[PDB]
Swiss-Prot record, chain B:
Record keywords: Iron, Metal-binding, Pyridoxal phosphate, Thiamine biosynthesis, Transferase
Modified sites of kind N6-(pyridoxal phosphate)lysine: K59
Gene Ontology annotations of biological process type: thiamine biosynthetic process; thiamine diphosphate biosynthetic process
SUPFAM superfamilies documented for this protein: Periplasmic binding protein-like II
Binding positions (pyridoxal 5'-phosphate): G112, E113, F114, G115
UniProt-reported outcome of changing W9A: Unable to sustain growth in thiamine-free medium
Active site: H63
The name this protein goes by in its record: 4-amino-5-hydroxymethyl-2-methylpyrimidine phosphate synthase THI5
Length: 337, 307
């Protein structure tokens, strides 16, 4: 009667709400016995949860969509990390540039399956063809392989892998700005990180899932309210995260955490479209999420998505150079009709 | 159709055979798709495997025995780390001494469950009573809490936690000998680390288990034969183990690796007796191992050297 929860990755700073929910006893106060597990290989994750072998866990939006398409019955019941900047990371001097064509003849790292597909597909739109480049499967070590020169560039998230590149550059006395990204968010939200359930587990235990999300919500509020105290609680439990890199990653992630846990209807509509178009998704495919098990009201709708993206970009820079914890203040949406 | 394999701990240097069997493709050459998982809490482990939620994994002998007793159908099919030195670790100046009585009024860390029971029980034999001491559950952080002063002593393995204390001492310029253990040869195979199977999974998949053990055996031979090459393969995959502490731990573990994977009939006989006696095991309890799935003969009853 323990409930298996499988992370999408080795412990990261953004996993803080799950671990705090455990260590602070919020799961216990809901009468839940969670067994948090960590994958050795992120690609095992959708298959294990989809097949019922694991009850719940986390995976990105693009992968959660493709999971149902490939016949793994999973449903997103909430959102953890909202729309982090994803792209092809590289160091200045790679010599890769904003010219997508500069990827020609380069070794490019992707984590598992979908990213490669993502680049296979972008080449056609830039007059390139696979293989004008060599794709290299890297699992959880994309950043590491860029730093070690085993690849020229690689796919990653701004608040995780980019921060790893920047910390390396700092050790070399090079400026942070030498860590550059070719954003895919402008070639979005594929890499939103979701709480997902096995479909039959969800059918059979809706009350437990609802209680889970309450515990998570309590921990998420704590982390947003008191990030510093939260962090020290986390790294006492998970000493592997007790370093400056993890802490910096944590600060960059702060602005991306979902405060309401709601699945964003627009984000899914966008991503389902993109995926449908890439033959990953059947033409009649329906988005596999629900907000039924969230026990609190939903917030006002997304405004100026490009505006927010631009504003977020600016915000994340201030975060890097100031070392702060600030949520992106957002002007509410004006309806002209 | 992936097979879930749950480690007994965060990745350690002694998990190297498993990871190498994966990264070197030995699991693949047997037509196995293993999903190696890591626990966040070692105590979840027997219950998850016992209940069938996870197919296979690792666990110490004392825990694997108590799992069946507590109604979790698990069976040991092979052995990984043989009889590492287990005991109460402490720093000289704690001030704890070889006198078990010195544990009086001290904070003593235990990993999760059986560790506490082991000390509750040893006190009765030393005229002490729980609680002449405070037991503190520490999970995977016993050494860390000793170093940080949050506990005075704690239960651990010589090649893992003790090495962690020693590396701390070296950072302080203190001698390694200041990391001391009260060894639980105070009545050491409880902490032998076993490959274990869910019973029903074993019933329904004996050919796969046999093939798993073959991949493991191949990796195990590689590690013993070429420990240095093996290590760099490991830490390329698992960069969290790329540090001097992990490498030192690895060298201490090397002598303890089981080279044949066989369950040792004597070790189990001893441990089953101990467990029966303190009330951890029913009087009619039968050891839950088998060497049936091993496909090779049983052998006769800063360096890398086998003993
Ligand atoms: C499960 C496990 C533990 C936890 O056991 P307790 O003594 O009950 O804390 C400790 N060490 C190892 C190696 C384990 O596998």
């Amino acid at each position: 009667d323990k409930i298996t929860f499988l992370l999408n990755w080795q412990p990261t700073p953004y996993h803080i709400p799950i671990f705090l929910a455990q260590t602070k006893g919020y799961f216990k106060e809901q009468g839940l016995d969670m067994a948090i597990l960590e994958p050795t290989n992120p690609s095992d994750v959708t298959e294990l949860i989809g097949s019922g072998k694991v009850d719940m866990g986390l995976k990105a939006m693009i992968h959660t969509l493709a999971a149902k398409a490939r016949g793994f019955p999973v449903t997103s019941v909430a959102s953890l990390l909202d729309e982090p900047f994803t792209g092809v990371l590289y160091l200045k001097g790679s010599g890769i540039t904003e010219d997508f064509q500069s990827l020609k003849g380069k070794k490019i790292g992707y984590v598992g399956e979908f990213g490669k597909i993502q680049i296979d597909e972008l080449t056609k739109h830039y007059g390139m063809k696979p293989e004008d480049y060599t794709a290299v499967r890297c699992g959880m070590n994309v950043a590491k392989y860029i730093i070690e020169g085993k690849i020229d560039a690689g796919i990653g998230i701004e608040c995780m892998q980019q921060v790893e590149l920047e910390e390396y550059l700092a050790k070399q006395g090079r400026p942070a700005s030498d860590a550059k990204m070719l954003r895919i968010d402008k070639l979005c939200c594929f890499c939103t990180v979701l709480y997902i359930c096995n479909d039959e587990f969800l059918k059979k235990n809706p009350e437990k899932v609802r209680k889970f999300l309450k515990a998570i919500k309590k921990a998420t509020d704590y982390v947003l309210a008191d990030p510093v105290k939260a962090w020290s609680g986390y790294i006492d439990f998970k000493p592997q995260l007790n370093n400056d890199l993890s802490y910096k990653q944590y600060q960059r992630c702060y602005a991306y955490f979902s405060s309401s846990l709601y699945n964003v209807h627009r984000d899914w509509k966008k991503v389902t479209g993109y995926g449908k178009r890439l033959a990953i998704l059947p033409p009649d495919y329906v988005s596999n999420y629900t907000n039924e098990y969230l026990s609190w009201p939903e917030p006002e709708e997304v405004s100026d998505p490009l505006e927010a993206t631009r504003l977020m970009a600016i915000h994340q820079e201030k975060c890097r150079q100031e070392g702060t914890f600030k949520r992106l203040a957002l002007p509410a949406h004006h309806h002209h009709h």
